[PDB]
Paper text:
Aquaporins are transmembrane proteins that facilitate the flow of water through cellular membranes. An unusual characteristic of yeast aquaporins is that they frequently contain an extended N terminus of unknown function. The tetramer consists of four independent water channels, in which each monomer has six transmembrane helices that adopt the typical “hourglass” fold. Loops B and E insert into the membrane and together form a seventh transmembrane pseudo-helix containing the aspargine-proline-alanine (NPA) [name] signature motif near the center of the water channel.
The structure was determined from two crystals obtained at different pHs. As is common for aquaporins, [name] crystallized as a tetrameric assembly in the I4 space group with one monomer per asymmetric unit, with crystals growing as stacked membrane bilayers having a gap of approximately 22 Å between the tetramer surfaces. In particular, the N and C termini do not take part in crystal formation and hence the conformation of these termini is not influenced by crystal packing. In contrast, our crystal structure of [name], captured in a closed conformational state, shows that a tyrosine residue from the N terminus enters the pore and blocks the opening of the channel by hydrogen bonding to a water molecule within the pore. Specifically, the N terminus folds such that each [name] protomer is intertwined with its neighbour within the tetramer via a helical bundle, which is stabilized by multiple hydrogen bond interactions. Hydrogen bond from Tyr27 anchors the bundle of [name] to the [name] scaffold and Pro29 introduces a kink allowing Tyr31 to insert into the water channel. A HOLE representation of the pore profile reveals how the water channel narrows to 0.8 Å in diameter near Tyr31, which is too small to allow the passage of water. pH-triggered opening, which is known to close SoPIP2;1, can be excluded as a possible mechanism for [name] since high-resolution structures recovered at both acidic and basic pH are identical, with a root mean square deviation of only 0.08 Å for 248 Cα atoms. Thus mechanosensitive gating emerges as a plausible mechanism.
Numbering used by the authors:
A (entry chain A), B (entry chain A), C (entry chain A), D (entry chain A): 11 to 273
Write the structure that this text describes.
Amino acid sequence: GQAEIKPEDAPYITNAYKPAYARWGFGSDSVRNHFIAMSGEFVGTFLFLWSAFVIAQIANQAPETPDGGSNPAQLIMISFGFGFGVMVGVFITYRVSGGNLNPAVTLALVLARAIPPFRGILMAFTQIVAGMAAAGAASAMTPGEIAFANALGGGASRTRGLFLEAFGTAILCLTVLMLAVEKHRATWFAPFVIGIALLIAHLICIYYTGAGLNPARSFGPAVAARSFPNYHWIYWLGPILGAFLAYSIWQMWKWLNYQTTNP
Amino acid sequence: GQAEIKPEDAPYITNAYKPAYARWGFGSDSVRNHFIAMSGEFVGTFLFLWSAFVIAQIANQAPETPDGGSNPAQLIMISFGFGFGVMVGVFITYRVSGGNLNPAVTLALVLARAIPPFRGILMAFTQIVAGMAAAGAASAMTPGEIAFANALGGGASRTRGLFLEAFGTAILCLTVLMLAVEKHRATWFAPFVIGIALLIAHLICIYYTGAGLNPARSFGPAVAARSFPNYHWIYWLGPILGAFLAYSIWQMWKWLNYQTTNP
Amino acid sequence: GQAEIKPEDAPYITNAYKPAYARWGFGSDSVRNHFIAMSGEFVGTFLFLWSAFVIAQIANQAPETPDGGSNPAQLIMISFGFGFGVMVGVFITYRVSGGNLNPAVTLALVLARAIPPFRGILMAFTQIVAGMAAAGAASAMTPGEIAFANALGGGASRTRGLFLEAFGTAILCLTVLMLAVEKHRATWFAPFVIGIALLIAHLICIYYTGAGLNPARSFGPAVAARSFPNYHWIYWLGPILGAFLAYSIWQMWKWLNYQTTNP
Amino acid sequence: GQAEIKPEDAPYITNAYKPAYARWGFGSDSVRNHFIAMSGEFVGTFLFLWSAFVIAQIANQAPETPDGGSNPAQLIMISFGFGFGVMVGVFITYRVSGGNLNPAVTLALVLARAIPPFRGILMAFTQIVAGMAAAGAASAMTPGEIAFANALGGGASRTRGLFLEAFGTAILCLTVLMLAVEKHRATWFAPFVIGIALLIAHLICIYYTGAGLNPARSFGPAVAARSFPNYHWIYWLGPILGAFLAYSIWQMWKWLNYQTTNP
Ligand SMILES: CCCCCCCCO[C@@H]1O[C@H](CO)[C@@H](O)[C@H](O)[C@H]1O
Ligand SMILES: CCCCCCCCO[C@@H]1O[C@H](CO)[C@@H](O)[C@H](O)[C@H]1O
Ligand SMILES: CCCCCCCCO[C@@H]1O[C@H](CO)[C@@H](O)[C@H](O)[C@H]1O
Ligand SMILES: CCCCCCCCO[C@@H]1O[C@H](CO)[C@@H](O)[C@H](O)[C@H]1O
Ligand SMILES: CCCCCCCCO[C@@H]1O[C@H](CO)[C@@H](O)[C@H](O)[C@H]1O
Ligand SMILES: CCCCCCCCO[C@@H]1O[C@H](CO)[C@@H](O)[C@H](O)[C@H]1O
Ligand SMILES: CCCCCCCCO[C@@H]1O[C@H](CO)[C@@H](O)[C@H](O)[C@H]1O
Ligand SMILES: CCCCCCCCO[C@@H]1O[C@H](CO)[C@@H](O)[C@H](O)[C@H]1O
Ligand SMILES: CCCCCCCCO[C@@H]1O[C@H](CO)[C@@H](O)[C@H](O)[C@H]1O
Ligand SMILES: CCCCCCCCO[C@@H]1O[C@H](CO)[C@@H](O)[C@H](O)[C@H]1O
Ligand SMILES: CCCCCCCCO[C@@H]1O[C@H](CO)[C@@H](O)[C@H](O)[C@H]1O
Ligand SMILES: CCCCCCCCO[C@@H]1O[C@H](CO)[C@@H](O)[C@H](O)[C@H]1O
Ligand SMILES: CCCCCCCCO[C@@H]1O[C@H](CO)[C@@H](O)[C@H](O)[C@H]1O
Ligand SMILES: CCCCCCCCO[C@@H]1O[C@H](CO)[C@@H](O)[C@H](O)[C@H]1O
Ligand SMILES: CCCCCCCCO[C@@H]1O[C@H](CO)[C@@H](O)[C@H](O)[C@H]1O
Ligand SMILES: CCCCCCCCO[C@@H]1O[C@H](CO)[C@@H](O)[C@H](O)[C@H]1O
Ligand SMILES: [Cl-]
Ligand SMILES: [Cl-]
Ligand SMILES: [Cl-]
Ligand SMILES: [Cl-]
Ligand SMILES: [Cl-]
């Protein structure tokens, strides 16, 4: 009735592939543990954003599309850079820091009480510094003017851009909450679903807002380009609103004990 | 012969990642449980269709292709919006409502007796309202005329469109039946396969019918655009026929005890 | 040291997601079991090839590329139709017939003794009839001349085409052998890897041979178009050689007891 | 509290899907075992690189983009050839050799002490010979001049190219280290994540360096084309630096006992 597990194969069963924040209980507030979490967020955010910035730099060397029209292949390439970039970053750092790689994701998880506030602030600070470093590195490593900073486009107003950013970020954060924070037989696979959520959010937003969805992603290139549009606030308030919306939905489902027919 | 499961990791084993309908037994008819199912279908259908509508809006800003020709990159982008959009929606809501997000899928599951008729009707109503909301939101958040409503194209007749919709929907529903409704070691992964099935169905249908495959997807934009083509019925009858075809195939396999060599 | 499995969740553990051929032992030669296998191959091959034929029909409505050049977006779309089409077909039919959907795959598995010769012949016959049906249906459901039949292109000779088909088919068959036929913790996931293998084989072959890789795929459209090129034999001999090459590699590894350090 | 495993299904549980190097302990230095490892690296590297070379050959038949601009669809196609090509190669050979398919990956794993130096050298030699064979085969099987050799482009300097190659290779090697070398419930899935990492690294590098990321990938086509650019060294030093960077990050995390809150 049972299948044998050879001793040498036990680690593949005993070592759960779960986000680090799931096991941040007593003992977590050591300098060692804060450093581990910061190092995961730094390495993960740097590799994700650096990759995606260079990919966007390249995609934006495509010949101009007339009459402000869209270029689907270009948008797909950029969406792959961020979606698959984050997927790889999260898979790498899942057991180091949980792979948030995004202050808005960290905010949603602080609201959900998956991550305590101080650790959350440390992680968010680390992500922003990593975004600055990634933007500086991508700039230094590519020819031409920086083409990976966020800006409104496609005829979108600031108000439309704000909403697009908020809803796009909500999809991302709700994915992290339901797949990574909730504990079940698919938690291990959350980094994939998270990557696809960000891919979709880019297909929604790049054409209209450049796709911020992540204050660390938006801030870094603005620093490197020495250019902040006056509507830069949409790349902070939008994702913040998105985090709160995702948290609210998750919280309603938690209050309802959603996963259980007869609680 | 056994591998140890640490107590803190038990939830990743004990909490099955299974569609909510699999555990809708005694106790399911409470107002609480009807609300949970409706909330999953609403949130899931809204996020999926809103995302996919904005993505289609953008893709359809590509320069016109001469002589009625196809634009593969454009079709790929739209197919990603719906296929990956549904994938994310289903992964998020799998343990809330089962993530049908489509009245034709719900119909197939009512025929299969996976979901009872009244709950099915509630879910289908919820999906249609969510589709209306998504269409209204996508319209309000994007510039220009609505470009995400379904219409015949590529020289396809209504009769050809009806068949394409029926067969495309059958592929989707048969995927849900064999991967999500059938209970096995891949049930947890059904949301991925479901997303790929919808991706393929879009590559089949967008050019010719706009790809309905989902009455809630077709109805919402028609309301928002205040425009119903006289052939709008193909987006209802087609998916209905597809649900019946998928159900029929599944039912034959169930009668045959397909999964067992010696029943 | 153990994690509890709730009784209602046991089916997700006890019901292995494994190819049907893995459990075709004593009792398999009943009319019922032959019919089940044929029905899986028919439904799976029809849905896969019908989908992929319509997708290719659409992709080939793209404006002509000058000077015989390639169109990467077009090639990607067609490769998705076949790669994701087969992925969905195999996931649906894995526990019905094993989801070969390809006489060359069945041949490799007959050589490997995973499927007995008579059952193999029945399956191969079924796949060819399903390919004819799919080609007829795709033709009837789409406007214009059939654009999904295989032909040499891109300046490739018959001899080059033969080799491309053989190597492409070998990649496909070796994937099925190592992921689906070999029994391990990734067998359940083989349909995904199989789909990606076919996706790659299409990116290799479409431009030069139209990508046969499957005698049932090549034969059906030729019948529907009432057109057989004199080099049609490359779409039979190529995949046959590929099946033998994959089998040979697998057989060497089996003789070597590849998976065990100290046999 | 437990779910039954039928005896015929035990192999899907007992046979771990783990990289071969994980079980190269006592007994590994036999001629048989060296041959098994070499055969996995040869077959895997040949199929991966041959596929990707033909796909790149085809993608590079696209009409020229004016003013040195990028072609996103072309870059996506090439990135799929290498990313999905390696994914398939690694899935096939995971239990044969571990599926390194890349001297830089092998170097990272020798540094990490996952593979001993002599076996590592044998594997690296095998990969280079397989790359030469793949380049020769791809050349012989395709018309026109070889279009799959690495070269600088997009206005990138040798110094920028070196850094892009190093960082891109680091992402690849860190993925292998954290997903395949580290033992946990996602180790079986590493071939997927590895493939996506290489896909991303191609979106970063193709436009600027042709994307080497693998000395065996760069050397083979140079031999077949009888052409070595004077900056060919970037395709050796870059990936070597990337392997060392990935190793360094992993080693820091190992020293920190990253995966454990209270060591
Ligand atoms: C001195 C007695 C107090 C010791 C503090 C309790 C240590 C709890 O520590 C917790 O242990 C769990 C396993 O039990 C781990 O999963 C968590 O990572 C860890 O934070
Ligand atoms: C879920 C509901 C989202 C509502 C977001 C709508 C944002 C309003 O968008 C506004 O639409 C106007 C149309 O007259 C335009 O004139 C404005 O420029 C634009 O900002
Ligand atoms: C307007 C739509 C009506 C919404 C009904 C919400 C369902 C509330 O249902 C309540 O949920 C509580 C928290 O889980 C439980 O403690 C109660 O048993 C249950 O009655
Ligand atoms: C013995 C008298 C009981 C009267 C209450 C009947 C309400 C039935 O309702 C049940 O309530 C249970 C407990 O809250 C929930 O777990 C079930 O989901 C719900 O269906
Ligand atoms: C008063 C005695 C009658 C109680 C009704 C039986 C409750 C069955 O309820 C069922 O229990 C299963 C677990 O056993 C769960 O998996 C299902 O979700 C649930 O519907
Ligand atoms: C599985 C079989 C599907 C059959 C669907 C075929 C739909 C018929 O399609 C019809 O084909 C005619 C060709 O002469 C055209 O003139 C019609 O306009 C078109 O509607
Ligand atoms: C024309 C093609 C012939 C189709 C043969 C169908 C196979 C029927 O097979 C029957 O299936 C029943 C239901 O599972 C079983 O109860 C019987 O034991 C079995 O004989
Ligand atoms: C003792 C006399 C038995 C005569 C019937 C022989 C039929 C063998 O046929 C067997 O029948 C079994 C029971 O239906 C099925 O489970 C097997 O799949 C089938 O192969
Ligand atoms: C009359 C005594 C002979 C009976 C024939 C043996 C039946 C073997 O039948 C085999 O049983 C296995 C489970 O044990 C299943 O996994 C296989 O699907 C089945 O073919
Ligand atoms: C693994 C080795 C594969 C070898 C396949 C090579 C197929 C030969 O290809 C041949 O190349 C010639 C070049 O002069 C051309 O003139 C021929 O038209 C062409 O058929
Ligand atoms: C020219 C390259 C040399 C190839 C060496 C092949 C390795 C053969 O190795 C042999 O394999 C047999 C089958 O597994 C085993 O029975 C023997 O123990 C073993 O010596
Ligand atoms: C007691 C004398 C033994 C002399 C033979 C030494 C060969 C060591 O070689 C070992 O042989 C084993 C059995 O074939 C294999 O399982 C191991 O993989 C191999 O390393
Ligand atoms: C003669 C006594 C010395 C025998 C050498 C020890 C053989 C160890 O050999 C190891 O065994 C492990 C399982 O235990 C396997 O997982 C490893 O693949 C294998 O290398
Ligand atoms: C992580 C930091 C990466 C630094 C890599 C920067 C590579 C330097 O790149 C250099 O930039 C100069 C700009 O003036 C150009 O003139 C040079 O041609 C170019 O090689
Ligand atoms: C400048 C930033 C400070 C970096 C702090 C590094 C954290 C070191 O933390 C140390 O790690 C050792 C190895 O795991 C442990 O043995 C010690 O218990 C622990 O104090
Ligand atoms: C009994 C006196 C103990 C004083 C040391 C308090 C340091 C608490 O720090 C703890 O140290 C543990 C052991 O190194 C680690 O496992 C925990 O992660 C860390 O939080
Ligand atoms: Cl503490
Ligand atoms: Cl009830
Ligand atoms: Cl029998
Ligand atoms: Cl030894
Ligand atoms: Cl799994």
